[PDB]
Design a protein around this nucleic acid. Structure first.
Lengths: 173, 60, 210, 129, 165, 167
RNA sequence: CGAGAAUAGAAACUCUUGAAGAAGUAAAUUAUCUACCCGUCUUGAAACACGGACCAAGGAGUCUAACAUGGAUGCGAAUGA
RNA sequence: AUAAACAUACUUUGAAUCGGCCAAGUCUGGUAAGCAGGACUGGCGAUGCGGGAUGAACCGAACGUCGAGAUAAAGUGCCAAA
RNA sequence: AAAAUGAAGACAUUUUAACGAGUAAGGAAACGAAAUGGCGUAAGGACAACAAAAGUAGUAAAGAUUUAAAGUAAUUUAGAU
């Protein structure tokens, strides 16, 4: 999952060649980003690739991929019944990192595959605007929990024997 | 004992094996059933040019 | 006797300098133009690609009669076969029709060089002979002003005036096998599949295939 | 000097169903049946003679000793391979008597020609001799 | 299952154009056809006499003979696995001047104009003009600069789903 | 596999003298060597015609040689076939190289003052072909060509193989 | 630093096994993988469709007459007799 | 624009065959049918190989005898290679 | 398929390149660069020790049973009884 900045213009009778269409598209690569970008133009402004020129398709990186932020993804997906608008909150350090979480959450809770979800916008909310019941318990400064029933950690697959000698124990960790 | 009446299945594939034989150029140059006066003009001139050419060959 | 071998060798050296000068000067001009647009706050639209490399992905069984003819006109008659295709409004539509059976994109100069040097061949007297000498290239393409392999590469990459005659001489490269897709080759590359337009990502697939 | 004689299949191509029925001999016959298991090349039974099994042309029809075979019926037959003693080998015919076999054998040693039946139709010099 | 009538399945093929009934044009009978021209067979149902077969409707043919009231037309017909030459005699009420070579004919005029100048320049010493460039498919567009003084930006994002009820 | 238009089958061109004629096999060898080395279209043409079948090597009469060389007096007609004699018209003086001369044809050419050369003589005198006129006989004058087709045809009917009660 | 070019530069070796049986090949057995009854009509048979208990010998596009095409042959306005 | 010289155009003689069946981002009769009949294409028939446990048609891919390598559909707890 | 060579080598010549699934069906003989290549049964006409005693055979024929070798195969070859 990567984020791209794509611009283009339409040069034909219908559209003046002075209107630039910008976008911020989350795509696995840059070929998919243009594919998403063109369909947005075709379904909204009747602009087709045969009558348009791309200008700049540059990757966008996180300025501070070390600061924890609370996100708020506004999205619309298609179900068996109809189309719905949903808002989901996520905690991550990168914009692209949170989007992959949204895709994995949507595909599990709602069983909605990737070719039904359209991301309208993604912003950053404060520490009190989180409304997810599970995620609201981890925004405070005084949060602590004893991680228990830990499986003992193996340093690497090198020491992973199939049969072990002696009893096996879990960890208060 | 009913049978299947007709099918075009595998008929375009059969037709394109030895493909559409185009007519030769000699087919487009036929002049049967043309204008009677136009035909008379052509025959009259072709007899005039032929006689003149054959006379010169005869002299030498 | 063979004093012309040194003379022929020098002409290859002189022409190679001219070829590299043309490619580097054109590449430099793009970089300078891009900077001035950034300085002036303008917008720069990169020129559309001219050369397309296409690879046959699917087999030969179960192809529509119209799709079967296009793959013959592009000389993609075998699975794992690569050809170079001129990009225009004619061949772009032709490739879209045969999309499920091909993957294509825009190759880099390094990709073009390695394809010709390692897998290149020519059709001489109806024989698919691999490239082994510049005399074999001078004989085949003498009248087209192509005497060295680096002249063969330069014409292909820049799409010169004699591209069609030069490109037709080259036999379609027979590539190896490589991981075609992430999901499978039954969907478009946009969906994670194998076929379709890969744009500049065809070089990664070609690297594992050459 | 002798090259490596390489055979692509050292077994025998046995007729189909020859093992089950005795009226069916082991000499190969291509199955023409419309439902034959072998001729449709089923897994397990797809062993048929093909031109691809042919051995190398350089080392074809060559005996393990490194030479070809040239049958002889008399001493004068040996005179046709005296120039090629390094390429051919004499093979006395199966009907040549014991008296004539010695004359061929003696002359072959004189002409330096190998004989593949050098110990054939010999007398009783194995017991009491 | 259809019948083998001559004019079967002509409820829509042989119908006149909407508000196109009555008499035809006058230029239809005044157009001068010459041998070698390209014509289009268009069966006019308003004239039942000499109506061509319904299979040749819309076919483009070449004039091969001119007769006092009929114009000879020669079109190609497709048979089992071959192609045959069909020769017809059609009144002008059923044919039409084809425009297939309209683009080709103007290119000949453009070349003939340039060539006529090249005979006015070579003898007089001036450099001779070249022939017009050949047609090519839409080529890849070249690089160009876009000014940032008269430009404007409009953002594009997926639209929030709005119900139509 | 590979998707081809067709598979390679033997090309339908003969490259040797058909039959076991020891002399026609020698002419093919003689002109196969001439065409390969001299690389002249004439020797290639003669080599190609020497390998045609008998039905494709039609005869040329002395009447046709006379008319073809009327404006070519210092020439040598070359026809790869039997040369027959037309008993209705005179034979002028001319040198003819041919595979075979009919007894009445050779006498007519010799008596008129001409020369009857074989093909090994021509290769000795004009190998590449210098004073030669290439001549071949008519192929469509065969009686078999009349019956080829369907006689019911409206344009070019066949000629109706005769048989029981043919009226 | 140095491409072209001119002058000088160079590779002939070890150890093990074998007429006390080497390398390869064959037969028998064992082990892993693999293998439905042949012929036939049929869209489709391993078929709950038919013939087949086993073996030997016999066993089925031949001859005469007319026509045509085609490949080799002789002669040629003649050819055959 | 692209492809095409073992290209292209054929000529003559003639074999077998016209019981077909299947799939479907197709249709008509029928409640429906592994039912009956059609338009376009691809297949089985005539076809083995790898996968779906087993399967005429599905997926990959069509076959001279082999050695080595990346691969396809698809799989990676054991049967079962991962 | 194309180039090279070619009175006789030999393996049905040398080199290069592409190709090689298959029911019904077709590819008669001959054709030096050969217009598919061959195995087997019987009978007829010739050839088979070139110095005037000229293929094998009571110093063991044909047949039969097996052991091995050559050929992709049809089959051939030799040993022992």
């Amino acid at each position: 999952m990567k984020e791209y900045y794509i611009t283009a213009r339409c040069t034909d009778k219908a559209h003046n060649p002075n209107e630039i269409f910008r976008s911020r598209v989350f795509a696995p690569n840059y070929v998919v980003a243009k594919s998403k970008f063109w369909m947005m133009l075709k379904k909204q402004h009747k602009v087709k690739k045969i009558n348009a020129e791309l200008l700049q398709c540059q990757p966008i990186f996180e300025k501070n991929p070390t600061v924890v932020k609370n996100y708020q993804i506004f999205l619309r997906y298609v179900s068996a019944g109809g189309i719905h608008n949903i808002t989901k909150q996520y905690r991550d350090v990168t914009r692209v990192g949170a989007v992959r979480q949204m895709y994995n959450d949507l595909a599990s809770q709602y069983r909605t595959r990737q070719d039904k979800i359209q991301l309208i916008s993604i912003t950053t909310v404060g520490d009190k605007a989180v409304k997810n019941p599970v995620l609201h318990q981890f925004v405070g400064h005084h949060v602590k929990f004893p991680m228990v029933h830990c499986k003992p950690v193996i340093a690497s697959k090198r020491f992973n024997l199939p049969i072990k000698a002696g009893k096996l124990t879990t960890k208060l960790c | 004992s009913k049978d299947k009446n007709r099918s075009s299945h595998n008929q375009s594939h059969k037709a394109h094996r030895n493909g559409f034989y185009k007519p030769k150029k000699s087919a487009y140059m036929s002049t049967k059933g043309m204008n009677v006066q136009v035909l008379k003009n052509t025959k009259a001139q072709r007899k005039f040019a032929l006689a003149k050419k054959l006379e010169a060959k005869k002299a030498a | 006797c063979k004093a012309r071998c040194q003379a022929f060798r020098k002409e290859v050296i002189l022409r190679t300098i001219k070829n590299h000068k043309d490619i580097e000067a054109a590449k430099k001009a793009v970089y300078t133009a891009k900077k001035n647009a950034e300085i002036n706050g303008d917008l720069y639209a990169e020129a559309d690609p001219k050369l397309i490399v296409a690879i046959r992905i699917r087999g030969i069984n179960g192809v529509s009669p119209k799709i079967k003819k296009i793959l013959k006109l592009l000389r993609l008659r075998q699975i794992n076969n690569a050809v170079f295709i001129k990009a225009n409004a004619s061949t772009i539509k032709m490739l879209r029709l045969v999309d499920p059976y091909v993957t294509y994109g825009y190759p880099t100069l390094e990709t073009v060089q390695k394809l010709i040097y390692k897998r290149g061949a020519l059709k001489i007297n109806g024989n698919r002979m691999p490239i082994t000498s510049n005399c074999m290239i001078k004989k085949a393409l003498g009248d087209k002003d192509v005497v060295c392999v680096d002249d063969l590469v330069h014409e292909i990459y820049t799409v010169g005036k004699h591209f069609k005659e030069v490109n037709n001489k080259l036999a379609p490269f027979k590539l190896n096998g490589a991981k075609i897709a992430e999901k499978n080759k039954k969907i478009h590359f946009i969906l994670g599949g194998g076929f379709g337009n890969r744009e500049l990502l065809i070089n990664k697939l070609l690297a594992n295939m050459i | 000097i002798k090259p490596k004689i390489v055979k692509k299949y050292t077994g025998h191509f046995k007729r189909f169903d020859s093992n089950r029925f005795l009226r069916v001999k082991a000499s190969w016959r291509v199955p023409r049946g419309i439902d034959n298991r072998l001729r449709r090349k089923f897994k397990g039974t797809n062993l048929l003679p093909k031109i691809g099994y042919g051995s190398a042309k350089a080392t074809r029809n060559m005996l393990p000793c490194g030479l070809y075979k040239f049958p002889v019926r008399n001493t004068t037959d040996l005179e046709m391979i005296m120039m090629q003693n390094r390429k051919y080998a004499a093979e006395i015919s199966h009907a040549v008597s014991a008296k004539k076999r010695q004359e061929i054998i003696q002359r072959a040693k004189i002409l330096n020609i190998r004989v593949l039946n050098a110990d054939a139709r010999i007398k009783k010099q194995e017991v009491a001799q | 299952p259809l019948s083998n009538g001559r004019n079967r399945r002509t409820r829509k093929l042989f119908k006149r154009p909407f508000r196109g009934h009555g008499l035809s044009n006058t230029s239809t009978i005044l157009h001068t056809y010459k041998v070698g021209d390209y014509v289009t067979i268009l069966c006019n149902s308003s004239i039942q006499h000499g109506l061509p077969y319904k299979a040749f409707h819309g076919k483009t043919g070449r004039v091969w003979n001119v007769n006092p009231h009929a114009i000879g037309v020669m079109v190609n017909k497709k048979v089992n696995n071959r192609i045959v030459v069909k020769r017809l005699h059609i009144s002008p009420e059923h044919i039409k001047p084809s425009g297939c070579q309209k683009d080709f004919l103007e290119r000949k005029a453009a070349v003939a104009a340039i060539r006529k100048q090249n005979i006015q320049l070579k003898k007089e010493g001036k450099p001779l003009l070249p022939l017009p460039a050949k047609r090519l498919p839409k080529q890849p567009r070249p690089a160009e600069l876009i000014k940032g003084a008269d430009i404007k930006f409009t953002t594009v994002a997926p639209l929030k789903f709005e119900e139509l009820y | 596999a590979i998707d081809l238009d067709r598979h390679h089958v033997r090309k339908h061109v003969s490259k040797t003298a058909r039959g076991n004629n020891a002399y026609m096999k020698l002419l093919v060898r003689l002109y196969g060597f001439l065409a390969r080395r001299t690389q002249s279209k004439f020797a290639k043409t003669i080599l190609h015609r020497l390998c045609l079948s008998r039905v494709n090597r039609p005869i040329v009469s002395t009447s046709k040689l006379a008319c073809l060389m009327k404006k070519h007096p210092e020439e040598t007609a070359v026809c790869v076939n039997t040369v027959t004699y037309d008993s209705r018209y005179p034979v002028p003086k001319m040198n003819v190289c041919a595979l075979k001369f009919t007894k009445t044809a050779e006498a007519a050419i010799t008596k008129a003052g001409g020369k009857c050369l074989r093909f090994d003589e021509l290769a000795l005198k004009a190998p590449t072909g210098r004073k030669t006129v290439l001549i071949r006989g008519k192929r469509n004058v065969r009686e078999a060509l009349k019956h080829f087709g369907k006689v019911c045809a409206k344009k070019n009917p066949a000629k109706q193989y005769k048989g029981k009660q043919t009226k």
